[PDB]
Structure 1
Amino acid sequence: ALSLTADQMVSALLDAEPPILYSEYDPTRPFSEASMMGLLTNLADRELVHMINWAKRVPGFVDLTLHDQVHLLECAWLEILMIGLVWRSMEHPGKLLFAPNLLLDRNQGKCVEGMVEIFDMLLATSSRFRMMNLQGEEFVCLKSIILLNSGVYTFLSSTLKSLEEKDHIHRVLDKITDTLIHLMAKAGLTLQQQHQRLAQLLLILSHIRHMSNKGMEHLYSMKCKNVVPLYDLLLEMLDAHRLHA
């Protein structure tokens, strides 16, 4: 990613996109009977496996140590799910497209205590993306920045190796920055609009962090899933052999 062109980064990021999954419930059966958090939790957990696959395809990520890859994903996984959700909801004003067969409005969020607060922030972010006319090429840049940025300030250590890792990450972030500006210039924005648009995009990332933090707080009162530490579960998924090569 530090020798990749802007064009090569964009195509690698587009190539790495995960699939859109469906909610798993019998569509021949009634709805009051479904647990909305059960449905949402089951969806999010299935997405997580595809998120690791994606992460490994972001330029520069697998050059990191396994521990650092784990750390970054443990820090960013809910931000990554949420930016994905806001992106697929953009063309669905007033609703959240959790899955193609699970499109929910704010009143359906009231179904779970404390959830409408989260729904309302996601919906607002979706509206901001639509208003900005966010582009698919810009979106994949933003999602990769979330992956690389959100945990880079909290690694414990400052070993030599740790210092090298942080350097590499900042270097990859720099290339994604170069890519976003390249995208915008190719689109014919002026120099001034480029830097303004870059700032507008990066400041939305502060809101997505906010939503992740509040959603983690909200999740930690429900059942959703807290068995086996997330780090261990991530480590397992990430620590693959090369036997099915």
Structure 2
Amino acid sequence: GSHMALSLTADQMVSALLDAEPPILYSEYSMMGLLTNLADRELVHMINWAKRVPGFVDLTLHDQVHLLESAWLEILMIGLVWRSMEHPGKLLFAPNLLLDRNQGKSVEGMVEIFDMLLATSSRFRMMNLQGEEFVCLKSIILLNSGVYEEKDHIHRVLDKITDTLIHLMAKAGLTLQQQHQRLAQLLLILSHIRHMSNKGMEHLYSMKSKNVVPSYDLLLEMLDAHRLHAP
């Protein structure tokens, strides 16, 4: 059978999100090349993950593309910041690619982006972000970032993810006041992730390459191509 997004319990939502998690990839090995190649390989896995986010396949192909076009960098960045949590002053791009601030100084303008990513990771570390909360946040990014009856459906799915976040906090023993405070603190970090993505996109455009950012067409092609993938 098929579970419709709005009928899932909080436990089922968490289970479906944890199950859809992409694998941890290795760097294939200069720095720019390694970071580009890794992002490209992670994008393929991001397509399969997005198709598994409850409510995402309920959207038209066009709406799915718009959401991925707006959110792809915020999604790579939140994944990066999550796995870099236990590595203060370093970014865990891959288990064979752990980079420090000074290493970012090799590429012009890259240190500014690394510093923002380091501060977000440090913030998640201080708040003791949990894996179940991280997966909720990543789905919120996907459904929220490109919002500007079908839009009401997206907002109802976003509401279900909020309910899921609150459920996790109430089960963790937080008071009603502490629940609203943590929810707000987590959602405010999403503003910082959007800012990092805009700065990241600007930096990517300040480069020689004419195909460094995924276009609407490439994202439509990848989403279309996914239909032809074997299960």
Do both proteins adopt the same fold according to a TM-score greater than 0.5, normalized to the shorter chain? yes
Deviation per CA, 1:86-107: give whole Å up to 9, x if none. Answer: 0000000110001110000000
1:203–1:229 Cα change, 3 Å: closer
1:59–1:38 Cα change, 3 Å: same
**Off by >2 Å, runs of 4+ in structure 1:** 240-245
1:67–1:91 Cα change, 3 Å: same
1:77–1:190 Cα change, 3 Å: same
Deviation, 1:240, is: 3.9
Q: 2:140 aligns with which of 125, 145, 166?
A: 145
Structure 2 CA distance, aligned partners of 1:196 and 1:244?
42
2:6 partner SS: coil
CA contact (8 A) 1:74 1:234 kept: yes
Structure 2 CA distance, aligned partners of 1:8 and 1:125?
28
Deviation, 1:221, is: 1.5
Aligned length: 226
Q: 1:7 aligns with which of 2, 5, 11?
A: 11
Structure 1 CA distance, aligned partners of 2:100 and 2:214?
32
1:189–1:234 Cα change, 3 Å: same
TM-score, normalised to structure 2, is: 0.94
Deviation per CA, 1:134-187: give whole Å up to 9, x if none. Answer: 00000000000000000002xxxxxxxxxx221110010000000000000000
User: Any gaps of 5 or more consecutive residues in structure 1?
Assistant: 26-34, 154-163
Structure 2 CA distance, aligned partners of 1:174 and 1:222?
39
User: Any gaps of 5 or more consecutive residues in structure 2?
Assistant: none
1:229–1:213 Cα change, 3 Å: closer
Over alpha carbons, which structure has the higher Rg? 1
1:98 partner SS: strand
Structure 2 CA distance, aligned partners of 1:206 and 1:235?
26
2:173 partner SS: coil
Structure 2 CA distance, aligned partners of 1:168 and 1:74?
20
CA contact (8 A) 2:204 2:213 kept: no
Structure 2 CA distance, aligned partners of 1:83 and 1:125?
9
CA contact (8 A) 1:90 1:130 kept: yes
Structure 1 CA distance, aligned partners of 2:86 and 2:106?
24
Note if 1:78 corresponds to 2:73.
Answer: yes
CA contact (8 A) 2:69 2:214 kept: no
Deviation, 1:226, is: 1.3
Deviation per CA, 1:44-82: give whole Å up to 9, x if none. Answer: 001000001000000000110000000000000000000
Q: CA RMSD in A?
A: 1.4
Structure 1 CA distance, aligned partners of 2:139 and 2:213?
27
Structure 1 CA distance, aligned partners of 2:226 and 2:34?
31
2:98 partner SS: strand
CA contact (8 A) 1:52 1:237 kept: yes
